[PDB]
Amino acid sequence: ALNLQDKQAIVAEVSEVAKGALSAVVADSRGVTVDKMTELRKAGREAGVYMRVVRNTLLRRAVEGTPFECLKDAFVGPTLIAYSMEHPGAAARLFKEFAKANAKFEVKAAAFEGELIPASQIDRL
Amino acid sequence: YVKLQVAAGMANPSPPVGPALGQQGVNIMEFCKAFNAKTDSIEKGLPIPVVITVYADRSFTFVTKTPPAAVLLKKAAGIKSGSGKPNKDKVGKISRAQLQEIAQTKAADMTGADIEAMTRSIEGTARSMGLVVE
Amino acid sequence: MLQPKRTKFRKMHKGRNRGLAQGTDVSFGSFGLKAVGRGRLTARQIEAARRAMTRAVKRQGKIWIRVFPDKPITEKPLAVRMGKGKGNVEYWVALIQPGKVLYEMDGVPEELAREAFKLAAAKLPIKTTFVTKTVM
Amino acid sequence: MFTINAEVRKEQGKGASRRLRAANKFPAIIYGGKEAPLAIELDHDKVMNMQAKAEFYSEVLTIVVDGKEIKVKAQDVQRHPYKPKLQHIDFVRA
Amino acid sequence: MKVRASVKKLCRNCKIVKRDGVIRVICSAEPKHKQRQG
RNA sequence: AGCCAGGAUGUUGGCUUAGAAGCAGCCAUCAUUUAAAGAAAGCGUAAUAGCUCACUGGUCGAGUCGGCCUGCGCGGAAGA
Ligand SMILES: [Zn+2]
């Protein structure tokens, strides 16, 4: 399990890569094998992208660390976030082609500049 | 959608190959001799893994992947059989250059980030069968 | 099966078992099997039990037996009237008072020891519990 | 740090002690040093859960008696034979 | 139906019950674990 | 607790075996991508495949787990 100290440190790591990151993408992680997920983790370390699946009420505490607070309603449902620490984009262009490749899950809401991007307009990134 | 580990230029004995993927609708001799035509390049005596992909029409496509961590560690330490008592009884040796060759072969075959991750997974299979890394 | 090598006298008075135990504490092992109830332990009982907890530990750690069957019990056989002397010596026993420590143990995981002691106590006539050695 | 609350014993002997033990309280003593001995009573539970730590035996604790602390160590302790209980504690002035 | 005076859980799927003032052990998995006290 | 999802690569770890592939048996039990995934807790195979579990993300919404000490009860408990 996870002690309160565990959760505290992890909130500090998500808040710490969130401050350092240029852009983020929140998505549904449900209904996909660990094979295709390690495939998007290779396509992740190759694109500079930091991949995570983190607790929701943990990510309200980490995203209270600004300026991703427009995403706190995007945390209802299973949360997989892609932070591109190197480049903006390359998460939002990789996820739409991974979700069209799999035809599972969603890829719900993005965040850039301090604002949230609705699901059909993430083609901006 | 089946997998086997088949010796280098070899195929079509009854107990190892024919029944296993032959109850799945696969033509046996095309797999056998296109796999000996592909893996003619693998050294004699090494089992090489082959992933057979079967479709509703019985026409199959197989990816022959690089020889196992355990087989490239049998050959890079010089040995034949590894340990029956691993890290208690130790049966051979490989310098870090062979860990890195086997982990370039398996850099084609791993999930690893760096050749240090693939060298460390070949490190793990190096501690599994007893072999010493020197 | 324990029994005194040689004795001063061959037979004994039935005696009583009264009052409480000495050696209430675990002086050797980390754990011990203490007796809550009061009763006589034949050598057979002690042996069977020691066996049980010897199977249980797969011959690891160590086992002490703190009790000894030093007092001889007699029985006249069947179909024999009263008198004509005292009966012949049948077997040996150890008098047990509440709070004695029958076996000690260590060099083993606690969980396993509670187990082995349950299995040991299955073979014993008297109420028993598990205990840990303490500082002071 | 361990702080034990206590009262001065107005009675003595076997009878007093066994009424003490029936009430879920138990007798102990404080001696050593220039002073006279001080016999006191304690709550069985508090102390039973307190000596459920090891340091209790290696350390300087305090005892609150009629507004007044004393600083002491654990000297020896007699336990009931089969029960998870404490018959008594020798406290030596620290 | 093992009928005895000591009744126990023989696996993880055995579930203890008191029916009509009897203690029984019921299993979904293994019919052989069906017990009653007596 | 339930219910949705995943339970990964090296790899069928080596030994042994006509076969052992997490699951006859012997020994090690590492490392990788990890939210998590035991060189596997059970069913399964000629050996696989196939099925849950450990573990983790989701939904849910406030108490829950199991020992200790005792009070009174239940079973153990059949005869002319
Ligand atoms: Zn059962």
CATH number of the domain residue C105 falls in: 3.90.1170.10
Q: How far is the CA of E17 from the centre of ligand 1 (A)?
A: 13
Q: How far is the CA of E32 from the centre of ligand 1 (A)?
A: 8
CB-based burial of residue B112 (10 Å sphere; 0-12 exposed, 13-18 middle, 19+ buried)? middle
SS3 per residue for chain A: CCCHHHHHHHHHHHHHHHHHCCEEEEECCCCCCHHHHHHHHHHHHCCCEEEEECCHHHHHHHHCCCCCHHHCCCCCCCCEEEEECCCCCCCHHHHHHHHHHHCCCCCCCEEECCEEECCCCHHHC
B111 contact residues in A (CB cutoff 8 A): 38, 42
| Phi, psi (degrees; rounded to nearest 5) at D49 | -80, -20
Close Cβ partners of E10 (under 8 Å, ≥ 6 residues apart): E25, E27, E30, E33
| Residue at B134 is within a domain | no
Q: Select from B42, B64, B86 the last residue of a domain.
A: B64
Total domains in chain B come to 2
| Residue at B81 is within a domain | yes
Chains that touch D (3 or more CB pairs under 8 A): C
| CA distances, C49 to each of C40, C63, C102, D66 (Å) | 14, 11, 10, 53
Angle between helices B115-128 and B96-109 (to 10 degrees): 110
* F78 C1' to C97 CA distance, Å: 36
- The tokens describing C112, both together, are 């396993």
| Residue at C119 is within a domain | yes
Q: Which of B110, B111, B121 to mutate to test the interface with A (most CBs of A within 10 A)?
A: B111
Strands C128-132 and C71-75: unpaired
- Answer whether A109's CB lies under 8 Å from A24's CB: no
Total domains in chain D come to 1
| Residue at C45 is within a domain | yes
* F6 C1' to B50 CA distance, Å: 26
- Answer whether A70's CB lies under 8 Å from A116's CB: yes
A82 alpha carbon, distance to own chain's centre? 3
| Residue at B57 is within a domain | yes
Expressed as residue numbers, the domain containing C46 is 21-136
C33 → chain D, closest CA residue: D82
- Answer whether A122's CB lies under 8 Å from A96's CB: yes
Total domains in chain C come to 1
Q: What is the CATH number of the domain that holds B37?
A: 3.30.1550.10
Q: What's the half-sphere exposure (Cβ side, CA atoms, 13 Å) at B110?
A: 23
Q: What is the CATH number of the domain that holds D58?
A: 2.40.240.10
| Number of helical (H) and strand (E) elements in chain B, helices listed first | 4, 5
Residue at shortest CA–C1' distance from F13:
B128
Interface of A with B in 10-39 (CB under 8 A): 38
| Residue at C3 is within a domain | no
Q: How far is the CA of C107 from the centre of ligand 1 (A)?
A: 34
| Residue at B106 is within a domain | yes
Residue at shortest CA–C1' distance from F49:
B2
Resolution of this deposited model, Å: 4.8
Residue-wise DSSP of D22-91: HTTEEEEEEE-SSS--EEEEEEHHHHHHHTTSSHHHHS-EEEEETTEEEEEEEEEEE--SSSS---EEEE
On whether any CB of chain D is under 8 Å from the CB of C24, the answer is: yes
Do B41 and B79 fall into the same domain? no
Q: How far is the CA of D40 from the centre of ligand 1 (A)?
A: 56
Expressed as residue numbers, the domain containing D81 is 1-94
Residue at shortest CA–C1' distance from F14:
B129
Q: Do A45 and B111 touch (CB under 8 A)?
A: no
Do B58 and B9 fall into the same domain? yes
Method: cryo-EM
* F18 C1' to B20 CA distance, Å: 15
Q: Which of C20, C99, C135 sits opposite D57 (nearest CB)?
A: C135
- Residue showing tokens 């361990």: D2
**DSSP letter assigned to residue E10:** -
Q: How far is the CA of E23 from the centre of ligand 1 (A)?
A: 15
| Residue at C39 is within a domain | yes
Expressed as residue numbers, the domain containing B84 is 69-129
| Residue at C133 is within a domain | yes
Angle between helices B96-109 and B69-76 (to 10 degrees): 150
On whether any CB of chain D is under 8 Å from the CB of C35, the answer is: yes
Close Cβ partners of A40 (under 8 Å, ≥ 6 residues apart): A51, A94, A98
d(CA A59, CA A72) in angstroms, rounded, equals 8
Q: Do C129 and D79 touch (CB under 8 A)?
A: no
D77 contact residues in C (CB cutoff 8 A): 136
List residues, by chain if needed, whose CB lies under 5 Å from ion ligand 1: E 10-11, 13-14, 27, 29-30, 33
Do B55 and B74 fall into the same domain? no
Q: State yes or no: cis peptide before A67, omega within 30 of 0.
A: yes
Do B59 and B92 fall into the same domain? no
